[PDB]
Amino acid sequence: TKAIITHVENTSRIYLQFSEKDSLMDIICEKLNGSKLQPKTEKAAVDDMCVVQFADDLEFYRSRILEVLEDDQYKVILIDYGNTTVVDKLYELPQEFTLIKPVAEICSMEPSAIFEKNKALTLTTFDALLDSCKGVVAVEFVNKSASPPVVRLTTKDKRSLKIYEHLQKLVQAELKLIQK
């Protein structure tokens, strides 16, 4: 099955939107960016659901409060995607979205000490790898009962690049160039 990677926390915590939900994601975006949203009139608390404007693209997203910060700021998660950001204004979540689960689901790649011993290098290499397929991946489940479920990811393009094995190879190659 096909999905798009929308956020990487680490190799064991990856947010993906599975293709079955592409139209649903489009409708959420269209509805949030198509009508006037209502600013909140009092402070929110951790875990409150709301909507924020994302500074990077100026568009609107379903959000959940992660932290109540000083200076009336909030760290929030964009629940449909997984990335976090800091905003100074919150909007009410329109009622029609209340029961709709977050679009993105969390999965994990297989474990590797290479990834754990070299976190920053692994993540920057992974980012470049994902950019090379614009985040579009084929997904096979290794362990569905795990939390997050463990998966194998392949670039959804002509290379069919095997990400778990390839990422290990690239990281080891850079470490070897520097250290040997």
Side-chain angles (χ1 to χ4, degrees):
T1 201
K2 185 171 76 179
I4 296 173
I5 294 174
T6 50
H7 178 67
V8 174
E9 188 68 29
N10 54 67
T11 63
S12 292
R13 187 171 169 96
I14 301 173
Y15 288 81
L16 289 76
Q17 298 177 349
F18 285 90
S19 71
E20 69 170 5
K21 286 185 177 174
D22 289 343
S23 290
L24 171 61
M25 190 68 255
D26 286 355
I27 291 160
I28 296 174
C29 291
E30 160 136 77
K31 284 171 174 292
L32 286 178
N33 293 279
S35 303
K36 50 184 176 311
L37 291 159
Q38 307 289 157
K40 290 197 69 65
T41 58
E42 59 182 305
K43 296 200 74 176
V46 169
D47 296 331
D48 282 353
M49 313 301 308
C50 52
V51 172
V52 303
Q53 186 169 28
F54 189 24
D56 295 21
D57 59 21
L58 291 188
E59 291 181 352
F60 294 90
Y61 292 84
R62 296 203 294 171
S63 52
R64 177 167 44 85
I65 305 297
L66 292 176
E67 189 176 0
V68 178
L69 299 172
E70 299 293 345
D71 286 86
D72 284 30
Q73 293 197 308
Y74 302 82
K75 180 176 187 186
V76 305
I77 176 174
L78 311 185
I79 62 165
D80 291 322
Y81 297 82
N83 58 305
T84 70
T85 188
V86 169
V87 305
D88 64 353
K89 184 179 185 182
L90 301 178
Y91 301 86
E92 310 289 357
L93 180 71
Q95 186 63 17
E96 60 178 345
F97 299 107
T98 309
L99 302 167
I100 311 297
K101 301 291 183 224
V103 171
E105 299 170 19
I106 303 173
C107 299
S108 171
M109 309 179 72
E110 295 161 281
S112 173
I114 297 172
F115 301 158
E116 305 297 336
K117 286 174 171 192
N118 305 286
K119 293 180 175 65
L121 173 57
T122 294
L123 291 194
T124 186
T125 306
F126 191 15
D127 283 328
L129 205 46
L130 292 177
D131 196 72
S132 82
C133 60
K134 321 307 289 182
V136 196
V137 289
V139 181
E140 166 177 335
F141 287 88
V142 183
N143 185 349
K144 292 184 181 184
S145 72
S147 184
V150 181
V151 297
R152 285 189 204 88
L153 306 171
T154 307
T155 61
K156 198 64 185 170
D157 53 32
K158 64 170 183 45
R159 301 169 295 171
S160 285
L161 185 138
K162 304 177 167 181
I163 297 168
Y164 174 67
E165 294 85 359
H166 198 75
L167 187 57
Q168 287 176 101
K169 181 171 75 178
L170 295 184
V171 168
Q172 291 288 88
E174 182 158 339
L175 295 171
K176 180 175 185 175
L177 178 58
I178 299 161
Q179 304 167 344
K180 309 294 179 190

